[PDB]
Each structure stands twice: as structure tokens, then as C-alpha cells.
């Protein structure tokens, strides 16, 4: 998994598109938003897209998800 764009400066890559991964928390008295489970669920998405490592854009914890209370979602780009 790659963090910034500087890490790949001058490299031949194929951008498959966009992939996402998230973890949901329905109530206050429920398990917390799991960011590492959201980074993995983004990679399985990129591996169904078939890629080695993913280009992570920004991992942020959502306040307004119409199914939960708090949801941590990691947005990334699948690369070959």
C-alpha cells in the first residue's frame, strides 16, 4: 500500500480505477470504527480489481452514514 504520489514519481503503473473499504458502528454502545479493517476491505476491493498495492487517498471517519452512527472509510486507487 502507497501513501503519497511522490513514492511513485517516475514509474510505469496502470490505474484500474477507484476502490473503497469501510467499518460500521451502529450505536454508542457498539464496537468502534476500525480504520485497519477499512484499509484491508479497500485492498480486497483492489485485489478483485487485481492489484499488488493500493494508492491510499484519505482515511476519514464519517459522521453521517445512513445505516450507522460512525463509519471509517478508506478511499484508494488500485495499481499494477
Amino acid at each position: 500500500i502507497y501513501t503519497n504520489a511522490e513514492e511513485l514519481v517516475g514509474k510505469p503503473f496502470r490505474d484500474l480505477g477507484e476502490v473503497s473499504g469501510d467499518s460500521c458502528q451502529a450505536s454508542n454502545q457498539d464496537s468502534p470504527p476500525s480504520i485497519p479493517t477499512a484499509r484491508k476491505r479497500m485492498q480486497i476491493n483492489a485485489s478483485k480489481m487485481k492489484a499488488n498495492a493500493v494508492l491510499l487517498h484519505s482515511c476519514e471517519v464519517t459522521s453521517g452514514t445512513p445505516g450507522c452512527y460512525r463509519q471509517a472509510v478508506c478511499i484508494g486507487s488500485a495499481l499494477n
Binding site: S47, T62, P66, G67
Partner: protein, 761 residues
């Protein structure tokens, strides 16, 4: 002219002996003016004299000299880029070095020269200045001041292109471009131009060091004629024809060929051959203007070791499972590929590759070596909202903590109301199915007052183990066991709350705030989930349903069950999925079993940004019915609820929410595109028009006894609120603006028209 004496004046670092002979004239010789401009030019050509004057005295021949200044040191200032030794190195080669005597005529030439070297890196123009400071005797310090400025580019042009416009090629920091040239070379090879060649690449320049122009000259036509396979095929001739399949009108491409060369190599690898060789030679036909590809195949067991290297964090035991074939057994090249991804999927490493090495002193055995390349992950958030207020949350993660394979998460949360701290141990792939072990140890301090409810305090602790085994990739089921301990305290006496305390067998004072209740509960938790959402974030189609079901297992002080169901359904309206219809529903209903009641800390509540927008958090449902009581810190000209000291003699109807055992909420939203934001970034913004409906009630309410009080058993009282919502992925983090109007509101329901929440990581 007869010379009977010769003398030299100004000699220092050059002895007489030198001069005496390295001049044609000598003592006792006859001299003419020819011998003057021979002697002078000869002594000048010694390259040791600043200046020379050789002339005749009556009888004496006198030499008047000035020796060149001898360099004592060469100092450099302003040279940020070039190393001082490197710069000295260039100079030593030119002829200028310490000990050498400087030629005050060549400084300019030295300048041109150093300036010349300065093209080595980006500075195609600069100014070098010579300080030629004098010193003792006739020595000199030559100091060099460098005015070095640092490359520029705007025009990249292609000449000799008739197949494509320059702009059409431009469709896809510049100091050095090598891989990029190969990428644009491939542009032509991908379109069938096998006889494409780059003849030259010129770097043009303007007067200053800042102005560069790139010209790439080209020689551009060909196509495919056919594929011909020949070699020790190993009898798989039937399969190879499928790999070398060709479409009519195929324009030649050297990478697609290589893909096939590797596919044949992979197939023969799958069949046990360790080193299958596939070579391809193109038969060039300029006559047909099409290449005919000749492919030579040359097909060339057991595994002694399955090695693990690069695991400097994960001990050499956890990784022993992630594959599809054992050590001390037969090799399966496909089984190596099946289990290849299994190392990447964990997210425990960064880069992973395979190597097959021959076992020492064995004609059939091979060691398969997998090379694996950070595990500590730190996540920190800080937000502000209508529910949580200022919310602090942090989690420390270690995926391969001390080489156990289990991931340890220590997460802490603090809202305005509750404070939660948990320690978690997780294994996302514990068995064959993809089952996890949701180990959790926790602590929750709950403050009801801050949660906009009737006052009470709940400090709780316990543990949970939840085993989730997947079924369908759309459907996931979880089930587990949990122990909890709740020490309730500081409860302001109200009917509702007390009702439950009486169910438990606990009977406290209804005029005192001084109370404490301790329970120990064991529970069996289950949770079914279905997700067919097209996207986890900003979904545009599909539906997600969640079921939660808690139940007390005998031995627990409390005896109740709780059941909730979340529904979310997205239905797209346009072909581009920019206009969507949403349907959210939340149901919840728990109750007491042993004639008892479900605890009030386990009640459901509606309202807030969460549910029914337009209403203050948790304000929906039953309200408290306080008993007359004496407040502890009583102060007049301060508001209290049903305080005897304020003149309270009977039960008080109130505005403070208490929630209930039964609740249902629904929303019908209509997602549209954000009004003025451009499509370029309109994927981060979600506008929405929602119609919210909701209610909470209590099935254990006594309508009959409390006639002067509202029927908190009546579920018919539906609240509705319609609004507008706006969600953004602003740089700050996630966000929402939910301006709603609650048109249908009942008794003491508190409004909160503008809502919102923000994050960061």
C-alpha cells in the same frame, strides 16, 4: 656586443642556475638585438615570470624580472551544488593548483572553464569571480565567488509524426526523462508500428540557464501476419492453440506477445516443468508490410524447503498457513499462485515475490522462497457534533504484535456524554471460511444528563467474544458471548426508571437522589447482516440490512432480550447514478423476561442527526414523570425538576426524554447532485431531500394508574420532519449540514433545526 657579466634582478623562487642556461645568451658571448627577442621570448617561455626585461648595460647584460605569484591556496564561496574537492579537481586538471605559479592572463579562461563545468547540473549560466588576494613574499590566495542560480521547461514538440497530431500525443519536475521516452515509444508499438524508431532527441535552449525546449524526432508502418508454434511442446499442443489465438485485423504489439509467451510459460510451469523456455523471432516482411511471428517453445517434482525471508517483525511461525501446498511434497505452480495473494491480503507486509532455487545436490528437488517486505498503525480523530459535542477518539493498532498473527487495537473514545475505552484482539481469517474472533475488553462511563436524557450515571465494564462466520459475500452472520457489569448511580427519581427497579426487586427512596444499583449480566449476542450495496461510501444502489439481537443467558441478574433492525435501500433513477432514492428504517424492541423489565440504560431513542433530523438528540419518546424529591446541592434562582424545596408536593410532567422499549423510525430520502459544484469533484458531495418519521414508546407504561399523565404506551404519536441534507468530504474530514423542519412534533419535543458533525485522521 661582448658580455663579460650577467646579472638577474627579482629572482626568488627561481635560482640563478635555471635562468643562466634557459636563455640562449651566456657570459663571454657576442650579442645582437636578434638574441634579445630570443632571450626575452625564451625566459618568458620559462612560464615562471610575471614580467621580463633583458637589456644591455655598458659592459654588463642585465635581466630585470618579476616572478609569477605562487598559489598558496584556492578557496571557494557560493558553490552550494559542486563539492569543494570536485571543484578543486577540475582546477588541478586545468593547470591551477596550490604550488603552481598563476598566470594572471588565464583567470578569464579559468572563469570560462569553471562556468563550462557548471553545466554538469541545472545551472546552464552563472558568474564566477576571481579574488586574487596577495600574501607574504610573493604568494597569492585565489578565492572564487560563485553566483549560481538553478533549469526550465514549457515546450515538448514532436516532428516527423503524420500518424498522430502533436496535441493528440500530448494526451497522456523535468530534469531527466528516460522511462517517459520509452512510454511514448510504446504509444506507437501499441498501434501496430513495429518498425517505429526514434532517430534523435534534441534539448534546445534560450540565453539564460532557465529556458529549455525538447524536440524528439521520429521515423514511423506494419501489422500482424500470424503466429507459428514449434518445439518440445510436451504434448500440450491442444492447449497452446487457445493461448496463441488471433483476431483478424490485428495490429502488431510486442507486449501482448510477451503476455502470451508468459502464459505458455505459466501453463508449462503448472504442468511441473520448472524452466519452460519461450522465444519468439519476428520474420519481417516489408513486401506484405506485416510481421510473421515465429515462436520457439522449449519445455524443460519436489519441494525440500518452503522458506520465509524479510520477516523482521513477524516471527517465523504465523506465516506457516497462508498457501495451497505443503513442504516435503510435490510442487504445483498453480497452488503457488492460488496461495500467492494470501500473503498480500493480510496487509501485514508491503511487497511480496516468489523465487524457485535448486536444492544442493539434487536432480529434481527445489526450494520455494517467498520474500515478504511496517505493522504499527496509529489512528487519531477529533470532532465536534450535536450528539457527541467535542469528541476525542484514538486507536493504536499492531497487526503482527509480537508475532501472534492477531491484531491488537487499543481504542479510546470520549463524547460529551459517554466515555468508552476498549482493548481488542482480532484475527480476520482465523479459519477456512474467513471467520473472525472479535475479542473485546472494555470500560464505559455513561452520563445520561449530557445525553439530553433524565439524569442517571452508569459506570460499566466487561468483555465480549464474537465469532463471525461468512455465508454469501452479501450475507455475513456474527454470534458471541459477552459479560457486563453495570454500577448505576445518581438517579433523579422518576416513575419510569423506578418501575424497572421494582421489577428487579430493588426499592429505593423516591425523595432522595442517593442511590446505587449493581448488576452482573451474561449475554448471548447475535447479528445477521446483508449488504448488496454497490459502494460502501456514498452508495447509489443496493440495500443493507442489519439485525442485532441480545438475550440474557440464565444466571444474569437482569432478564431481558433486545432486538433491532436497520434497513438502508438505494435505488438509482438515472443511468449515470446521480439521482437516487433512499429508504432507511430502524426498528427496535426489547423487553423483560422474568416478570422483570429491560434496563433503562438499554432503552432506544430517536431524534438527532442520527435518525429523525429537526429534533434534538434522543428527545423523541416518553418523557420523565418525576417524583417530589429533595435536591442535594439546592440553590434558589436555579431550575430543578420536581424539587420539594421549590414547592413540589406531587408528580411532575416533564420535557426530559427517557426513551423506551419500543421504537421505530423511517426515512425516505431523495439524493440529487449538489447544485453548483463541478462533476470534476462532485463525487465527494451529496445533497439530499429527506422525509423523516419516528416514534418510541413504552409497552410497560400504566395508563390506568397515571390518568393525569400522557399515555407513554401510545405508539400512534408519529413525529415527522422534512428537510435538506448536505454531506461533503471537505479537507477537514467528513461533514453534514442537515437543516430540517419538524412539522409533526408532540409534547415537549425539543427542536434542533440545524445539525452537523466533522472528523479528521
Amino acid at each position: 656586443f661582448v658580455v663579460k657579466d650577467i646579472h638577474f634582478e627579482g629572482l626568488q623562487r627561481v635560482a640563478v642556475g635555471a635562468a643562466l642556461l634557459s636563455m640562449p645568451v651566456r657570459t663571454g658571448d657576442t650579442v645582437n638585438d636578434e638574441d634579445i627577442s630570443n632571450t626575452i621570448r625564451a625566459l618568458f617561455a620559462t612560464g615562471n615570470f610575471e614580467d621580463v626585461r633583458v637589456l644591455r648595460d655598458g659592459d654588463t647584460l642585465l635581466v630585470q624580472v618579476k616572478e609569477r605569484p605562487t598559489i598558496a591556496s584556492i578557496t571557494f564561496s557560493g558553490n552550494k551544488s559542486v563539492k569543494d574537492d570536485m571543484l578543486k579537481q577540475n582546477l588541478e586538471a586545468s593547470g591551477v593548483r596550490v604550488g603552481e605559479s598563476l598566470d594572471r592572463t588565464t583567470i578569464a579562461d579559468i572563469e570560462k572553464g569553471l562556468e563550462d563545468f557548471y553545466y554538469s547540473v541545472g545551472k546552464y549560466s552563472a558568474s564566477v569571480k576571481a579574488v586574487v588576494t596577495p600574501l607574504p613574499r610573493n604568494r597569492v590566495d585565489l578565492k572564487l565567488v560563485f553566483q549560481e542560480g538553478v533549469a526550465e521547461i514549457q515546450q515538448i514538440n514532436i516532428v516527423g509524426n503524420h500518424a498522430f497530431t502533436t496535441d493528440e500525443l500530448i494526451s497522456h519536475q523535468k530534469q531527466k526523462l528516460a522511462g517517459d521516452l520509452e512510454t511514448l515509444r510504446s504509444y506507437y508499438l501499441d498501434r501496430g508500428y513495429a518498425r517505429f524508431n526514434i532517430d534523435s532527441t534534441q534539448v534546445s535552449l534560450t540565453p539564460d540557464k532557465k529556458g529549455i525546449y525538447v524536440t524528439v524526432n521520429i521515423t514511423e508502418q506494419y501489422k500482424l501476419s500470424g503466429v507459428e508454434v514449434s518445439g518440445n511442446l510436451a504434448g500440450h499442443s491442444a492447449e497452446i492453440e487457445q493461448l496463441t489465438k488471433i483476431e483478424p485485423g490485428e495490429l502488431y504489439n510486442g507486449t501482448k506477445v510477451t503476455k502470451m509467451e508468459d502464459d505458455i510459460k505459466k501453463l508449462l510451469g503448472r504442468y511441473g516443468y520448472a524452466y519452460p523456455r519461450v522465444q519468439s523471432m519476428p520474420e519481417i516482411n516489408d513486401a506484405d508490410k506485416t510481421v510473421k511471428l515465429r515462436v520457439n517453445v522449449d519445455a524443460g517434482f519436489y519441494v525440500r524447503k518452503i522458506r520465509f525471508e524479510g520477516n523482521d517483525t513477524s516471527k517465523d511461525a504465523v506465516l506457516r498457513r497462508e498457501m495451497r501446498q505443503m513442504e516435503g511434497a510435490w510442487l504445483g505452480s498453480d497452488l503457488v499462485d492460488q496461495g500467492k495473494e494470501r500473503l498480500n491480503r493480510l496487509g501485514f507486509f508491503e511487497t511480496v515475490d516468489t523465487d524457485t532455487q535448486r536444492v544442493p545436490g539434487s536432480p529434481d528437488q527445489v526450494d520455494v522462497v517467498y520474500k515478504v517486505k511496517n505493522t504499527g498503525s496509529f489512528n487519531f480523530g477529533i470532532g465536534y457534533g450535536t450528539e457527541s459535542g467535542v469528541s476525542f477518539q484514538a486507536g493504536v493498532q499492531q497487526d503482527n504484535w509480537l508475532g501472534t498473527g492477531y491484531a491488537v487495537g487499543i481504542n479510546g473514545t470520549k463524547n460529551d456524554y459517554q466515555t468508552y475505552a476498549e482493548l481488542s484482539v482480532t484475527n480476520p481469517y482465523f479459519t477456512v471460511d474467513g471467520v473472525s474472533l472479535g475479542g473485546r475488553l472494555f470500560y464505559n462511563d455513561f452520563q445520561a444528563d449530557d445525553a439530553d436524557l433524565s439524569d442517571y450515571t452508569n459506570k460499566s465494564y466487561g468483555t465480549d467474544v464474537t465469532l463471525g462466520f461468512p455465508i454469501n459475500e452479501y450475507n455475513s452472520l456474527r454470534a458471541g458471548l459477552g459479560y457486563v457489569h453495570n454500577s448505576l448511580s445518581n438517579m433523579q427519581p422518576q416513575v419510569a426508571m423506578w418501575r424497572y427497579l421494582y421489577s428487579m426487586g430493588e426499592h429505593p427512596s423516591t425523595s432522595d437522589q442517593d442511590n446505587s444499583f449493581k448488576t452482573d449480566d451474561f449475554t448471548f449476542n447475535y447479528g445477521w447482516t446483508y449488504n448488496k450495496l454497490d459502494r460502501g461510501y456514498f452508495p447509489t444502489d443496493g440495500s443493507r440490512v442489519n439485525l442485532t439481537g441480545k438475550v440474557t443467558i440464565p444466571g444474569s441478574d437482569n432478564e431481558y432480550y433486545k432486538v433491532t433492525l436497520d434497513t438502508a435501500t438505494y435505488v438509482p433513477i438515472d443511468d449515470d447514478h446521480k439521482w437516487v432514492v433512499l429508504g432507511r428504517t430502524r426498528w427496535g424492541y426489547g423487553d423483560g423476561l422474568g416478570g422483570k423489565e429491560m434496563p433503562f440504560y438499554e432503552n432506544f431513542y430517536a431524534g438527532g442527526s442520527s435518525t429523525v433530523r429537526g429534533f434534538q438528540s434522543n428527545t423523541i419518546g416518553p418523557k420523565a414523570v418525576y417524583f417530589p424529591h429533595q435536591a442535594s446541592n439546592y440553590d434558589p434562582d436555579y431550575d430543578y425538576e420536581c424539587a420539594t424545596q421549590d414547592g413540589a408536593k406531587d408528580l411532575c410532567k416533564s420535557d426530559d426524554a427517557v426513551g423506551g422499549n419500543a421504537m421505530a423510525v423511517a426515512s425516505l430520502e431523495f439524493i440529487t447532485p449538489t447544485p453548483f459544484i463541478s462533476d470534476k469533484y462532485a463525487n465527494s458531495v451529496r445533497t439530499s431531500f429527506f422525509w423523516d418519521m419516528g416514534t418510541v414508546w413504552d409497552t410497560n407504561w400504566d395508563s390506568s394508574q397515571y390518568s393525569g399523565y400522557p399515555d407513554y404506551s401510545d405508539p400512534s404519536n408519529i413525529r415527522m420532519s422534512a428537510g435538506i441534507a448536505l454531506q461533503w468530504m471537505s479537507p477537514l474530514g467528513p461533514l453534514v449540514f442537515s437543516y430540517a423542519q419538524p412539522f409533526k412534533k408532540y409534547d415537549g419535543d425539543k427542536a434542533e433545526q440545524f445539525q452537523f458533525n466533522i472528523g479528521k485522521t
